[PDB]
Structure formats: C-alpha cells, structure tokens
Amino acid sequence: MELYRAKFGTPERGWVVLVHGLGEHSGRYGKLIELLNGAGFGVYAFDWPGHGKSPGKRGHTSVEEAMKIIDSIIEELGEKPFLFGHSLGGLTVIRYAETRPDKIMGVVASSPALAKSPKTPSFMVALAKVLGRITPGLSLSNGLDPKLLSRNPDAVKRYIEDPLVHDRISGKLGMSVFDNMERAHKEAERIKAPVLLLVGTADIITPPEGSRRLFEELKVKDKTIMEFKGAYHEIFEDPEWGEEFHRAIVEWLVSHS
Ligand SMILES: CCCCCCCCCCCC[N+](C)(C)[O-]
C-alpha cells in the first residue's frame, strides 16, 4: 500500500527511523523530531498500515509487516540508520535489531512491549493465537485504558481527542504482538548494535520488568537501560520526566553518531 512517509531535517549525523506504537501515529512525535533535527539528525517517519495517515483497515497489520517497511526505508536511504520505537514500535525495532542485525547503527526502545500487561488476561493471549489464524482480519478493541498512558492529564485528553488515534487491533496484529514478544527475548543474543531501553517504573501497559529481563538477556556490550521513577507508559509528556526523557534520547544518539 501507499503509506504515509515523511522525511524531516538534514541528516548531518545520520538518520533516525521513527516507529510508532499501536493505535497512534507519527504525528504525535513532533517534539522529539524537532529536537533530533536540531541536533543534526534526519528523521524518517511513517504511519503503520491501518494507522494515522496511512491507508488500510484500522489496526490491521503486523510486526513483520512493519519490519519489511523498515527494510524498504533502509534501502531508500542507502545507509544504516538508528531506530527509535515506542511500545509496539519498541518491540518492532528490537525485533528488527535481532533479525536484521547488521543493518542499523543502534536501537532506542521507549516502553517496548516485552511483557504482558496484568490487565490482559491470559486467555486473551490464547484467543489471539487462534483469531490470528482463522479470522486475521477481525477487528477488536485493544483494551487500552487511556488514563494509564501518562501522568499528564492534558496529554491523555489529547490522545482521546486525536482523530487519527484509534482503539482497533486485528486478530493478525494481536497474534503478531504476542508471538514477537516471546521471540524478542529468545533472540536477544542476535542483537549486535548498541541498545538503549527507556521505561517508566509505574507502567502497567508494558510492565518494565520486560525491559529489565531483555537487558540481562542481551549480549551486546553497549547496552543501557534508563528508568523514570513514577512515570506511566508514555514518558514523552510526563510532568516530571518528559524533558529529561527527550534529552537522554538525543544525548545517546549524539554520542553514538
Ligand atoms: C486479537 C485478539 C485479542 C487481542 C486484544 C488484546 C489486547 C492486546 C493489547 C496489545 C498492546 C500492545 N502494546 C500496546 C502494549 O503495545
């Protein structure tokens, strides 16, 4: 399909490919894109199939599809980029670093989906394995409580009112998410590029222990995990940590350029 793709800035320090999460879109990352451009990076943004300004039934895609999109972006750029992904997008960039290990300069994962939420019952995981096979196009609610996204009430309100944000997830995408969560841990030793993981300690959408386990599972030496005490799933707009969170990402990318 014809996706929504956009390039921002001049890639004096290289490229950073931005990979958004489930139900959102790349337009929510204007602040980070501006900061990265200001530091000398180009940013390549896209909206997943079924998300944002891209076409397709809402929420109907897969982690594998996103990785193929990343393949295409790296072919277009003609050089190794950094990857930045959040939530579903954080899981995706970790899986990309595992399955295309020599194609990137490094990977930054914000709240990557590496552990099941306690709000997601175990039978829902088993159901997704079935529905992903027999009714892959079936569209269901993602179960997300927006109040769990951020300690910033205005950020939560914006998310709710954003017309590009949706709560759909297909059977195919649900199956892909839980399957790739498992594989992300099993294949952790395949990563060769430097890694930065960023988590909020109060995140129950993607429990931080998933990142903590991954950090220990990684074999690459240049690995870093940063915790933000009290932050929810989205640290970007957190009142206490939003600015620091942005700064850590930029500083890490600058130091690895
Ligand atoms: C498809 C069968 C039922 C699937 C619905 C279960 C909800 C899955 C929530 C996925 C959340 C992944 N996330 C947002 C943390 O990245």
**What tokens were used for 125?**
């995981």
Cα–ligand 1 centroid distance for 178 (angstroms) = 8
Cα–ligand 1 centroid distance for 22 (angstroms) = 8
- Active-site positions read 87, 203, 233
Resolution (A): 1.7
Which of 175, 166, 171, 241 is closest to 203 using CA atoms?
A: 241
Does 66 contact ligand 1 (Cβ within 6 A)?
no
Cα–ligand 1 centroid distance for 243 (angstroms) = 28
Residue nearest to atom 4 of ligand 1 (CA): 174
Residue nearest to atom 10 of ligand 1 (CA): 142
**Range(s) of the domain holding residue 103:** 1-257
Does 143 contact ligand 1 (Cβ within 6 A)?
yes
How many domains, in total, are found in the chain?
1
